[PDB]
Amino acid sequence: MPIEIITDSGADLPQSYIREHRIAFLPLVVHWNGQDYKDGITIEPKQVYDAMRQGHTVKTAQPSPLAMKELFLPYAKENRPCLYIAFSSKLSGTYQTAMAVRSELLDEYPEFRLTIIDSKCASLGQGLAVMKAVELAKQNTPYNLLCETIESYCRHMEHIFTVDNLDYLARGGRISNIKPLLHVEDGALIPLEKWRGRKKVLKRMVELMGERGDDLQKQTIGISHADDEETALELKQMIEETHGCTRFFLSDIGSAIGAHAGPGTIALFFLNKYIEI
């Protein structure tokens, strides 16, 4: 059987893509005021931003171990080889929980080939890795080689972003007129710089990309935004002007991530080592 690719809502890939490429989907949980929702399935970013915009503190949770097991079980039974590219273990306990679920399943279904990669990635940084996995899988790339390659790919992904207010991230717990510029280091969020006004952080984001990027023109640059396509499209131009990039993938930030980053969040993703896949 062909390798089945699995991912969670931390990847920020549009459901149109998930469904098209038959990607098993594990929704992260979004909740507040007694109601639980499933990221990308029963809740949309606007509903979250709107809630926060109304003085609400939208919270998130890991999917349940039961939910995880229900998702993998079918594959274990038909004994189909799987690759689950998980949201950064430093941003959620989802990964570890899934490894636990994996052991349980192995006990019942030995021979079940399920590899879980702790991506150390978030949003489209993770999504880009998932899309590459889909490509390698449809090319019938050998299982181990495919898994090893996607892990190396994840190890070279950069996540450079800005939010409107660090309070959201702070109250969210993933971090302890100035706009902040942050980045993802080994799976964790690290506040990096402080700039006056939006225009400058965007200019600086594109600049840092040029410093860390590798063979940027040959790469598919990822850009995710918190319901602010206008700025994303703005950032896209600055990049094609400055770096001469031609391949882009823009998408909205998911609800779970959005509940932490907050409105006005803009991020770019690229490899610091051009792995040619």
Ligand X SMILES: CCCCCCCCCCCCCCCC(=O)O
Q: Which residues are near ligand X by CB under 6 A?
A: 28, 60-62, 91-94, 122-123, 159, 161, 174, 189, 224, 253, 256-257, 260-261, 265, 267
Least separation in angstroms between residue 89's CB and ligand X is 10
CB nearer ligand X, residue 62 or residue 219: 62
3-state secondary structure of 10: helix
CB nearer ligand X, residue 147 or residue 253: 253
Least separation in angstroms between residue 111's CB and ligand X is 30
CB nearer ligand X, residue 5 or residue 26: 26
CB nearer ligand X, residue 119 or residue 123: 123
Q: Could you please report the per-residue DSSP string of 40-81?
A: TTTB-HHHHHHHHTTT---EEEPPPHHHHHHHHHHHHHTT--
Helix (H) or strand (E) holding 233, with range, is: helix 229-242
Least separation in angstroms between residue 241's CB and ligand X is 22
CB nearer ligand X, residue 121 or residue 146: 121
Least separation in angstroms between residue 3's CB and ligand X is 26
3-state secondary structure of 165: coil
Least separation in angstroms between residue 214's CB and ligand X is 20
Contacts of 169 (CB under 8 A, 6+ apart): 163, 175, 182, 189, 260, 261, 262
Question: Could you give the CA distance from residue 45 to residue 154 in angstroms, rounded to a whole number?
Answer: 25
CB nearer ligand X, residue 123 or residue 219: 123
Question: Could you give the CA distance from residue 91 to residue 84 in angstroms, rounded to a whole number?
Answer: 16
Least separation in angstroms between residue 80's CB and ligand X is 27
Q: How far is CA 105 from the centre of its chain?
A: 25
Residue at token pair 């984001």: 205
Question: Could you give the CA distance from residue 155 to residue 186 in angstroms, rounded to a whole number?
Answer: 8
Q: Is 129 exposed, middle or buried (0-12, 13-18, 19+ CB in 10 A)?
A: buried
CB nearer ligand X, residue 115 or residue 224: 224
Question: Could you give the CA distance from residue 215 to residue 218 in angstroms, rounded to a whole number?
Answer: 6
Least separation in angstroms between residue 81's CB and ligand X is 27
